[PDB]
């Protein structure tokens, strides 16, 4: 009866176990277990009387860690049936009822063993166990063999998105429901996004160079495989090749072509010279990451990036989350950068403020002033330190001119913009009450940016991102069906709630065409528009783009902001991920621009 | 549907409420409450449209802390309200709980609870769910907890608590949530008698030992509880012959000289000071005192909550049914149950067991025994009075509690046979040493075990098990447990035969020795047997006694082993409680004595 997660293509991707109860008939209980409970307590005034009353609770008793009853405890703690438990394990379970958190083997192992051994000592005294049984049982370690009750190995960020969001809003009882959650996640598009982010971050990583082995003279057993990287121990180093021991005991050779890319990393802005020998890259006893080819006939030295990234893709008509990638790989941590990654948008915020200039009567052709500006003490300068004078609004956006954005902010007013940013999705207490908000200094989430860019793809409507299509109970009854706010109700036909208009149709179409011009003046599609973003000191690289059927926002940055390096702008780091995802997601679909 | 506790006459004495859920129709929900849940988190991705639709699925299930599952259970548990009676602030408070019911709990962390609630109220304002007028009112509003008590145990507190604590001790908190109906062996008439006998008995000792001063001085009056017909008061004015005191209801009373003239100061366990002549000698302003009213009211008197403790345990000798149980002076003073958990030395109350084993080996109440000095290795046991009686009958040695005779009998019987019998009534091997001191009543015992022991004399040599549950009924009235005890005599009541641990003649001869000790060595009844006990330096006062239908054990002493005083003995401290109880418990019952069989 777990919480089951499906993709929009009816594939089960995840299963989340809640409170567990596995009832057993009383005659199925090994004698030593009942004895371990009979000996858990000093005295009973209900010794054969406790036996009759134990029979009424043996299946309901809270045994910590979502375990209700003896069988669920055997399963949760040891992955064993009640038959498989040892004297020591039976006494460990028998000691938990009194205080399952104070006596828990997971949180208090010391306190737990004190309790277990005493019960064993009291089992010995009662004649329940032999002296030999007691001697082994007391000497036995914790032996916890806790199975994973969170099956999430297909599209990890999609599965976790469901679990984590349910738990945040409805608490842990949300899992205990046994519901089937049918998401808006497209499994093909999700598989594409996962591969694209992985490739994008590795491309960035390799050009920034080899940072050395992740560990030296440490046990290989202590490392784990992920993102098609396999831990290995270097055993032999040759002039052009090295030998490594895999986690299965097999010895592999990595030839020159497999490691030659390994120029040493110096900093974000510097790599050393191409390596002239294998000895400059690896040491014997080093823990490296290898990747095989499809045939497994050749191996290469690979590297997990230190840089991070994310992708979020939504339908601009209804806000359906089609694909979501929260980091390089889910094994690293459960942290989802699309939903929780607060970062500065920089220039990706500019189309929002320029669309507000269009609301006021300006056209993409209207002349704007790119001349020096000073407000109070602050002198907003341009990233190139140049001033272009009278230029068209569209050129000013394309070139991301800070003085123009600052001047546009005064002409349109701060509150009017803050309100629009709030309309676009953005958080009220995250949007400052100053002029820096024309530069993309407020913190945003990639999902908010996707939501805001949808206003351009949909004709000026505010959509709300959503991941649930429908929910069923365990019996098959549909208990929830998504009723999103639609930008275009007749577009579903190719139904009920109409989304609110946040921009004039003409402002949205004008902005969409500027972004299309911005994309075409750098794949084989004429229905895409997009905007790059780079924060100060290249701490962030963004790409926010779309067609009329899909909005995609990509981001690249370090979790602890450090520069990505000069040369690492939006169009260089984030855009290739977007291009790779968009090109494959929109492959063999007609042109879909704005209505 | 709570855990229900019943007396043997099918009357409800306790209700223990566990996990609570009061489901509601979604239309019955105030919109402001739904809005509070919408303002609880910054971002919803299921402007909070879809969360409102999904909320309905979880609204009656969400764990809200303190056994509350769903909104209505939370409104009841925290505020003793229905959802439609909650203020905007209280709605914001509950909506703050789902994320971390223990990190935001108003009981556990009131500052984190307040911070979270105000954030939610702030968001309700920003989102336009509440007007600034509503917001300003709501943030200034305090926590205002009004938590009802869901553990109802105000009739026979030690009886109700026995069930709750014992079910939790063996089965954990799931035992309370079961909703089972526990039909106990407790006799309500007798339980009521037991409570008063212990209270009267302890107040009698306490008084003889003098006024030890107010329980507190310059401490908040709201931190004290009324119990055992004693009400905490704050002394506000001290006159020459009287004193004024502030009661918890907010009223002020006057206690005249009559109600405080008794207050002789406690000097030590053996000394009481000079009778007071003025109020200042007894009380000071800001003192926290205990007062007692009357049958109606009119007059209040200065009373004293005893430092000394006691207990009473009454069991049926045929099947071990627990009829009456008092764990201390008052359960509201101490939750601790001394009958079940109070390990103490029995002293002379263990002697009848040893003397019964000597009768088992062929001696009679008349066999001559030597009360004379003895040395067992490096140990010389002495008689408490430092007197030696020479050659005397066994029964005189038992009545007078001759340690030297006890030691000689232990040599005749053997330590092992003695230890085996001690164990036959719940005594742990670990709790009984393999030495000659066991004859002097040195092992630590529980009153419940001594009661079980004395039932061997009352029943004719059989081993019975103390039991407090007759049957268990599920929430839907089905009998899910029926007690199957071991009966000493089956025709006497209907299946299990109890194991004989003592020869019929030994049990019967001991019973008559105990009857003699009670009729000539100290109630209008002749079917009674019993033995007093007084440990060294009077650290314990005991009285174990019976008739053929009821075995009662009473104990008096300080929880921290301290002398009851030179002059205090079992016969003076524990025996009067036993008397008061037995006389009243056995009223209108025909004579009931022990049966002999060859
Ligand atoms: C927007 O992202 C910023 C803006 C906040 O200053 C500018 C900077 C760049 S990159 C050009 C760097 N200057 C070279 N001398 C962009 C961009 O779109 O990435 N816009
Ligand atoms: C039993 O409790 C003890 C025995 C084990 O020593 C004796 C002592 C007394 S009191 C007699 C006065 N002694 C001091 N001079 C009793 C008793 O039961 O009261 N039995």
Coordinates of C-alpha atoms in Angstrom, one line a residue, chain B residues 189-523:
Chain B
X189 CA -16.5 0.1 47.7
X190 CA -13.1 -1.3 49.0
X191 CA -10.9 1.0 46.8
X192 CA -12.8 4.0 48.3
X193 CA -12.2 2.6 51.9
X194 CA -8.5 2.0 51.1
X195 CA -8.0 5.6 50.0
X196 CA -9.4 7.1 53.2
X197 CA -7.7 4.5 55.5
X198 CA -4.2 5.4 54.0
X199 CA -4.9 9.2 54.1
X200 CA -6.2 9.0 57.8
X201 CA -3.3 6.7 58.7
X202 CA -0.5 8.9 57.2
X203 CA -2.2 12.1 58.7
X204 CA -2.2 10.4 62.1
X205 CA 1.6 9.7 62.0
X206 CA 2.4 13.1 60.4
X207 CA 0.5 14.9 63.3
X208 CA 2.2 12.9 66.1
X209 CA 5.5 14.2 64.6
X210 CA 4.7 17.9 64.5
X211 CA 4.5 20.9 62.1
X212 CA 7.5 21.0 59.8
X213 CA 6.6 24.4 58.4
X214 CA 4.8 25.5 55.1
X215 CA 5.6 23.4 52.1
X216 CA 6.9 26.5 50.3
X217 CA 7.7 30.2 50.9
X218 CA 7.4 33.0 48.4
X219 CA 6.5 30.7 45.4
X220 CA 3.6 31.1 42.9
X221 CA 0.3 29.7 44.4
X222 CA -0.8 28.6 40.9
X223 CA 2.1 26.0 41.0
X224 CA 0.3 23.9 43.7
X225 CA -2.5 21.3 43.5
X226 CA -5.5 20.6 45.7
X227 CA -5.8 16.9 46.6
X228 CA -6.7 14.6 49.6
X229 CA -9.2 17.4 50.8
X230 CA -6.3 19.9 51.3
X231 CA -6.3 23.3 49.5
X232 CA -3.1 25.3 48.8
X233 CA -3.3 28.8 50.3
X234 CA -1.0 31.8 50.5
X235 CA -0.5 33.4 53.9
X236 CA -1.2 37.2 53.4
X237 CA -1.5 38.4 57.0
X238 CA -0.4 36.9 60.4
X239 CA -2.3 38.1 63.5
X240 CA -1.7 37.2 67.2
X241 CA -4.2 34.2 67.3
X242 CA -5.3 33.9 63.6
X243 CA -4.0 34.2 60.0
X244 CA -5.4 35.4 56.6
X245 CA -4.8 33.3 53.6
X246 CA -5.4 33.6 49.8
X247 CA -7.2 30.6 48.1
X248 CA -6.7 29.6 44.4
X249 CA -10.4 30.6 43.6
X250 CA -9.4 34.2 44.4
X251 CA -11.1 34.4 47.8
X252 CA -9.5 35.0 51.2
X253 CA -10.2 33.0 54.3
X254 CA -9.4 33.3 58.1
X255 CA -8.1 30.3 60.1
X256 CA -8.7 30.8 63.8
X257 CA -6.6 29.6 66.7
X258 CA -8.7 26.3 67.0
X259 CA -7.5 25.2 63.5
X260 CA -3.8 25.9 64.1
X261 CA -3.3 25.3 68.0
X262 CA -2.0 21.8 67.2
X263 CA 1.1 23.0 65.4
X264 CA 3.9 21.8 67.8
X265 CA 7.2 22.2 65.9
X266 CA 9.0 19.0 64.6
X267 CA 12.5 19.0 66.2
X268 CA 13.4 15.4 65.0
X269 CA 11.8 12.0 64.3
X270 CA 11.8 11.6 68.2
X271 CA 11.2 15.2 69.3
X272 CA 8.4 17.8 69.1
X273 CA 8.7 21.3 70.4
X274 CA 6.6 23.3 72.8
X275 CA 2.9 24.0 71.8
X276 CA 2.6 27.4 70.1
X277 CA 0.9 30.4 71.8
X278 CA 0.7 32.7 68.8
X279 CA 0.3 32.5 65.0
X280 CA 3.8 34.0 64.1
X281 CA 5.4 30.9 65.7
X282 CA 3.6 28.7 63.0
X283 CA 3.4 31.0 59.9
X284 CA 5.0 33.9 58.0
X285 CA 3.4 36.0 55.2
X286 CA 4.1 34.6 51.6
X287 CA 4.1 31.0 53.0
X288 CA 2.3 28.3 50.9
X289 CA 0.0 26.4 53.4
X290 CA -2.6 23.6 53.1
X291 CA -6.1 24.2 54.5
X292 CA -9.1 21.9 55.1
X293 CA -12.7 23.0 55.0
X294 CA -15.7 21.3 56.7
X295 CA -18.8 19.1 55.8
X296 CA -20.4 22.3 54.4
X297 CA -17.8 25.1 54.8
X298 CA -17.8 27.9 57.6
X299 CA -14.4 27.0 59.1
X300 CA -10.9 26.3 57.6
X301 CA -8.1 24.6 59.5
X302 CA -4.3 24.4 59.0
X303 CA -3.5 20.9 57.8
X304 CA -0.2 19.2 56.7
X305 CA 0.5 17.0 53.7
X306 CA 2.6 14.1 55.2
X307 CA 6.3 13.7 54.2
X308 CA 5.8 10.0 55.3
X309 CA 4.5 7.6 52.7
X310 CA 2.3 4.5 52.8
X311 CA 0.5 2.0 50.7
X312 CA -2.3 -0.6 50.8
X313 CA -2.7 -3.7 48.7
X314 CA -5.8 -6.0 49.0
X315 CA -6.0 -9.3 47.0
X316 CA -8.4 -12.3 46.8
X317 CA -6.5 -15.4 48.2
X318 CA -8.3 -17.9 45.9
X319 CA -7.3 -16.4 42.5
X320 CA -5.0 -13.5 43.2
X321 CA -7.5 -10.8 42.0
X322 CA -6.5 -7.3 43.0
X323 CA -9.5 -5.8 44.9
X324 CA -8.0 -2.4 46.2
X325 CA -4.7 -0.6 45.6
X326 CA -3.3 2.6 47.0
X327 CA 0.2 3.5 45.8
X328 CA 0.8 6.4 48.2
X329 CA -0.7 9.2 50.2
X330 CA -2.5 10.7 47.1
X331 CA -1.8 10.1 43.4
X332 CA -1.9 13.9 42.7
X333 CA 1.0 14.3 45.1
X334 CA 2.9 11.4 43.6
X335 CA 2.1 9.3 40.5
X336 CA 4.5 6.5 41.9
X337 CA 2.8 3.2 43.1
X338 CA 4.6 1.8 46.1
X339 CA 2.5 -1.4 46.1
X340 CA 3.8 -2.4 42.6
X341 CA 7.1 -0.6 42.5
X342 CA 8.2 0.2 46.1
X343 CA 11.1 -2.2 46.9
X344 CA 11.5 -2.4 50.7
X345 CA 12.7 -4.8 53.4
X346 CA 9.8 -6.8 55.0
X347 CA 11.5 -7.5 58.3
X348 CA 9.4 -9.7 60.6
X349 CA 6.6 -10.0 58.0
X350 CA 8.9 -12.6 56.2
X351 CA 9.2 -14.7 59.4
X352 CA 5.8 -16.7 59.1
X353 CA 7.2 -18.2 55.8
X354 CA 10.3 -19.6 57.5
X355 CA 8.4 -20.7 60.6
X356 CA 5.9 -22.4 58.3
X357 CA 8.8 -24.4 56.7
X358 CA 9.9 -25.5 60.2
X359 CA 6.4 -26.9 60.7
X360 CA 6.7 -28.6 57.4
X361 CA 9.7 -30.5 58.8
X362 CA 7.8 -31.8 61.8
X363 CA 7.7 -29.1 64.4
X364 CA 4.5 -27.7 66.0
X365 CA 3.6 -24.2 67.4
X366 CA 4.7 -25.7 70.7
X367 CA 8.1 -27.2 69.9
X368 CA 10.7 -25.7 72.2
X369 CA 13.3 -23.3 70.5
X370 CA 16.3 -21.6 71.9
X371 CA 16.3 -17.7 72.0
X372 CA 20.0 -17.4 73.0
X373 CA 23.1 -15.7 71.5
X374 CA 24.4 -17.3 68.2
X375 CA 27.4 -16.7 65.9
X376 CA 27.3 -17.8 62.3
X377 CA 30.9 -17.5 61.1
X378 CA 31.9 -13.8 61.4
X379 CA 28.2 -12.8 61.9
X380 CA 26.4 -12.5 65.3
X381 CA 22.6 -11.8 64.9
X382 CA 21.2 -9.8 67.9
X383 CA 17.6 -9.5 69.1
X384 CA 16.2 -5.9 68.5
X385 CA 15.6 -5.4 72.3
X386 CA 19.0 -6.9 73.3
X387 CA 17.1 -9.5 75.3
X388 CA 17.2 -13.4 75.1
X389 CA 14.3 -15.6 76.3
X390 CA 15.9 -19.0 76.4
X391 CA 13.8 -22.1 75.6
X392 CA 10.4 -20.9 74.4
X393 CA 7.6 -22.4 72.0
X394 CA 8.0 -21.6 68.2
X395 CA 4.7 -19.5 68.2
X396 CA 6.1 -17.2 71.1
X397 CA 9.3 -16.9 69.1
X398 CA 7.2 -15.9 66.0
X399 CA 5.0 -13.5 68.0
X400 CA 7.9 -11.8 69.8
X401 CA 10.0 -11.9 66.5
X402 CA 13.1 -13.7 68.0
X403 CA 16.0 -13.2 65.3
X404 CA 18.1 -15.8 67.1
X405 CA 15.3 -18.4 66.8
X406 CA 14.8 -17.3 63.1
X407 CA 18.5 -18.0 62.5
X408 CA 18.3 -21.4 64.2
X409 CA 15.2 -22.4 62.2
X410 CA 17.0 -21.3 58.9
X411 CA 19.7 -23.8 59.8
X412 CA 17.1 -26.6 60.3
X413 CA 15.1 -25.7 57.1
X414 CA 18.2 -24.8 55.0
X415 CA 18.8 -21.5 53.1
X416 CA 17.8 -23.2 49.7
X417 CA 14.4 -24.5 50.7
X418 CA 13.7 -21.0 52.2
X419 CA 14.9 -19.2 49.0
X420 CA 12.8 -21.6 46.9
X421 CA 9.6 -20.7 48.9
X422 CA 10.4 -17.0 48.8
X423 CA 10.6 -17.3 44.9
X424 CA 7.2 -19.1 44.9
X425 CA 5.5 -15.7 45.4
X426 CA 7.2 -13.5 42.7
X427 CA 10.5 -12.9 44.5
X428 CA 13.5 -12.7 42.1
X429 CA 16.5 -15.1 42.6
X430 CA 18.7 -11.9 42.4
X431 CA 16.6 -10.1 45.1
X432 CA 17.2 -12.9 47.7
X433 CA 20.7 -13.5 49.0
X434 CA 22.2 -17.0 49.8
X435 CA 22.9 -16.1 53.4
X436 CA 21.4 -16.3 56.9
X437 CA 20.2 -12.6 56.9
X438 CA 17.1 -13.7 54.9
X439 CA 15.7 -15.0 58.3
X440 CA 15.9 -11.3 59.5
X441 CA 13.9 -10.0 56.5
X442 CA 16.7 -8.2 54.7
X443 CA 15.8 -9.0 51.0
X444 CA 14.0 -6.2 49.1
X445 CA 10.4 -7.0 48.4
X446 CA 7.3 -5.5 46.9
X447 CA 4.0 -5.2 49.0
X448 CA 2.2 -7.0 46.1
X449 CA 4.6 -10.0 46.6
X450 CA 4.0 -10.0 50.4
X451 CA 0.2 -10.0 49.7
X452 CA 0.8 -13.0 47.4
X453 CA 2.8 -14.7 50.1
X454 CA 0.2 -14.2 52.8
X455 CA -2.5 -15.7 50.5
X456 CA -0.6 -19.1 50.8
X457 CA -1.7 -19.2 54.5
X458 CA -5.3 -17.9 53.7
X459 CA -5.9 -20.4 50.8
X460 CA -4.3 -23.6 52.2
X461 CA -0.8 -23.7 50.8
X462 CA -1.4 -22.7 47.1
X463 CA 0.5 -20.3 44.8
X464 CA -1.8 -17.6 43.2
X465 CA -0.8 -14.9 40.8
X466 CA -1.8 -11.2 41.3
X467 CA -4.1 -10.1 38.5
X468 CA -6.0 -6.8 37.9
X469 CA -7.9 -7.6 34.6
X470 CA -11.0 -9.8 34.6
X471 CA -11.8 -9.2 30.9
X472 CA -11.1 -6.9 27.9
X473 CA -13.8 -5.8 25.5
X474 CA -12.9 -4.2 22.1
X475 CA -14.5 -0.8 21.2
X476 CA -17.4 -2.8 19.5
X477 CA -18.4 -4.7 22.8
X478 CA -16.8 -8.1 21.8
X479 CA -14.9 -10.0 24.5
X480 CA -11.3 -10.1 23.2
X481 CA -9.7 -11.4 26.6
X482 CA -11.1 -13.3 29.5
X483 CA -8.9 -13.9 32.6
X484 CA -8.0 -17.6 33.2
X485 CA -6.4 -17.5 36.7
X486 CA -5.0 -20.4 38.7
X487 CA -7.5 -21.1 41.5
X488 CA -6.4 -22.5 44.9
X489 CA -9.8 -24.1 45.2
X490 CA -12.0 -24.5 42.1
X491 CA -15.2 -25.8 43.9
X492 CA -14.9 -22.5 46.0
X493 CA -16.3 -20.3 43.2
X494 CA -13.6 -22.3 36.9
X495 CA -10.7 -24.2 35.4
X496 CA -6.9 -23.8 36.2
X497 CA -5.6 -25.5 39.4
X498 CA -3.0 -23.6 41.4
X499 CA 0.3 -25.3 42.4
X500 CA 0.6 -26.2 46.1
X501 CA 3.8 -24.7 47.5
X502 CA 3.2 -25.5 51.2
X503 CA 1.8 -28.6 53.1
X504 CA -1.9 -28.0 54.0
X505 CA -1.2 -28.6 57.7
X506 CA 1.7 -26.1 57.7
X507 CA -0.4 -23.4 56.0
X508 CA -3.3 -24.2 58.4
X509 CA -1.1 -24.2 61.5
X510 CA 0.6 -21.0 60.5
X511 CA -2.8 -19.4 59.8
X512 CA -3.9 -20.3 63.4
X513 CA -0.6 -18.9 64.8
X514 CA -1.3 -15.6 63.0
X515 CA -4.9 -15.7 64.2
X516 CA -3.6 -16.1 67.8
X517 CA -1.1 -13.2 67.3
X518 CA -4.1 -11.0 66.2
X519 CA -6.7 -12.0 68.8
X520 CA -4.5 -12.2 72.0
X521 CA -1.3 -10.4 71.1
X522 CA -3.0 -7.0 70.2
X523 CA -12.9 -5.1 64.6

